[PDB]
């Protein structure tokens, strides 16, 4: 068959929303507190994550049907998925070549080691790379990548969500466009969809793991003081 | 007459405490979010102030008799005087030559203009320079400058102080050493003391003015998000 207008205008909006919020030159990174190779990377990475949340929020605001949700459900969805969306978009800067996130010269190239000097260990930093590699290999079209993010964000299974029925409906509509698009426009993608939805499950573990690690970090004031107000708010437990 | 042992060992400790917490090369400034000339300097100056609070705390911890105060009075004294102490120590980087704070190349030289792009206006930025100039002119010895700071910090007239009698006693002892020192070691300083105590009154206005300006800034989340956890805590109203 072939895509419908309503469906296609979802893709235009999402692709445009991503372009308006993701810079392939990573030029704004010079405004972050400089990276330093207890937890010397914490200051810089905290700024990177903070910056990203802001970007994920601008993108979310442009997902069709999201601005119609209650301020509360919008907050609940962002708080629970923020980290997952940061991880998804980060794939664009990930390099299978050097297994790192290359956002600039040697200064902004992020190795597994670096994330360690920011409060995280190898044991759990391992799944992040595996996720990045598996995701990178799927060679997603910009349209599929931007859709997966919109779908992740609209997961109705999030702590704190109220109108889980409406969220469920929206996520469903987006899942259609993603399925249709693969079928129509993606040659050789018979299993792709299932593989993508699979990636959403991997993001949950990565999410949970991060929560535990972050919790520890935040309870130690000498460390939480290195974070930013937005990060402390988005990953905080206040309800 | 001449100084006593107890008195002199107060001076050794204070001078050493300042040396251990003030770097004349301002080398750590490269770790702050870079300066940018709504409120583009806010990010960098917020880091400068944050850094300073940390330094003022390390100094305070070394003021004789301070660590014996209750954790509460220590917090109350720091919260109310922090800004004044930041202003006093800043005199060391102030230049009557160019009316600015020269902490590095053109990048870390702070003009009145810059503080404006950080949420503050000229109307009240004016008294800060006048204070800096008047203070600079007094050509204080390192011993007198470090004493004035210790005295400012131990003002018993601070909102939230409990044991105001003990604070009052400590500040009094320091006032002795300052008075004695001027007399014994400071040739030509008959009015100096009175001039110094005068400066404490100017710091109160500067303090009050800052409070009002800061209050406005902090109530606007798009701005407070640019501040640091420590700054938000020290200048915050939580009791």
């Amino acid at each position: 068959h072939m895509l419908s207008d309503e469906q296609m205008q979802i893709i235009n909006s999402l692709v445009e929303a991503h372009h308006k919020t993701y810079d392939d030159s990573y030029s704004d990174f010079v405004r972050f507190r400089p990276p330093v190779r207890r937890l010397s990377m914490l200051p810089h990475l905290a700024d990177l994550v903070s910056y990203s949340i802001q970007k994920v929020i601008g993108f979310a605001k442009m997902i069709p049907g999201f601005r119609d949700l209650t301020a509360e459900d919008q907050i609940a969805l962002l708080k629970s998925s923020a980290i997952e969306i940061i991880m998804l978009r980060s794939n664009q800067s990930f390099s299978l070549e050097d297994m790192s996130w290359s956002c600039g010269g040697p200064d902004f190239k992020y190795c597994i080691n670096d994330v360690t000097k920011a409060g995280h260990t190898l044991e759990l930093l391992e799944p992040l790379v595996k996720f990045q590699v598996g995701l990178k290999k799927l060679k997603l079209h910009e349209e599929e990548h931007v859709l997966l993010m919109a779908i992740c964000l609209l997961s109705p299974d999030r702590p704190g969500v109220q109108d889980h029925v409406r969220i469920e409906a929206l996520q469903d509509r987006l899942c259609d466009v993603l399925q249709a698009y693969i079928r129509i426009q993606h040659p050789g993608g018979r299993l792709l969809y299932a593989k993508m939805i699979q990636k959403l499950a991997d993001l949950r573990s990565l999410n949970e793991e991060h929560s535990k690690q972050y919790r520890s970090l935040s309870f130690q004031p000498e460390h939480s003081m290195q974070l930013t107000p937005l990060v402390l708010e988005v990953f905080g437990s206040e309800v | 007459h001449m100084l006593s042992d107890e008195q002199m060992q107060i001076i050794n400790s204070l001078v050493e405490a300042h040396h251990k917490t003030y770097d004349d090369s301002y080398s750590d400034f490269v770790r702050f979010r870079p300066p940018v000339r709504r409120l583009s300097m806010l990010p960098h100056l917020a880091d400068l102030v944050s850094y300073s609070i940390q330094k003022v705390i390390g100094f305070a911890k070394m003021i004789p008799g301070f660590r014996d105060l209750t954790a509460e009075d220590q917090i109350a004294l720091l919260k109310s005087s922090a800004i004044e102490i930041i202003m006093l120590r800043s005199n060391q980087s102030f230049s009557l030559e160019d009316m600015s704070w020269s902490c590095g190349g053109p990048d870390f030289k702070y003009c009145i203009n810059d503080v404006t792009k950080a949420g503050h206006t000229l109307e009240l930025l004016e008294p800060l320079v006048k204070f800096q100039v008047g203070l600079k002119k007094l050509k204080l010895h390192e011993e007198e400058h470090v004493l004035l700071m210790a005295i400012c910090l131990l003002s018993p007239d601070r909102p939230g102080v409990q044991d105001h009698v003990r604070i009052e006693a400590l500040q009094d002892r320091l006032c002795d050493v300052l008075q004695a020192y001027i007399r014994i070691q400071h040739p030509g300083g008959r009015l100096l003391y009175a001039k110094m105590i005068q400066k404490l009154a100017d710091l109160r206005s500067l303090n009050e003015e800052h409070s009002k300006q800061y209050r406005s800034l902090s109530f606007q989340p798009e701005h407070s998000m640019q501040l640091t956890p420590l700054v938000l805590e020290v200048f915050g109203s939580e009791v």
Partner: peptide, 10 residues
């Protein structure tokens, strides 16, 4: 609270 998020969300 969530003061900052409410703001960023317009």
């Amino acid at each position: 609270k969530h003061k900052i998020l409410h703001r960023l969300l317009q």
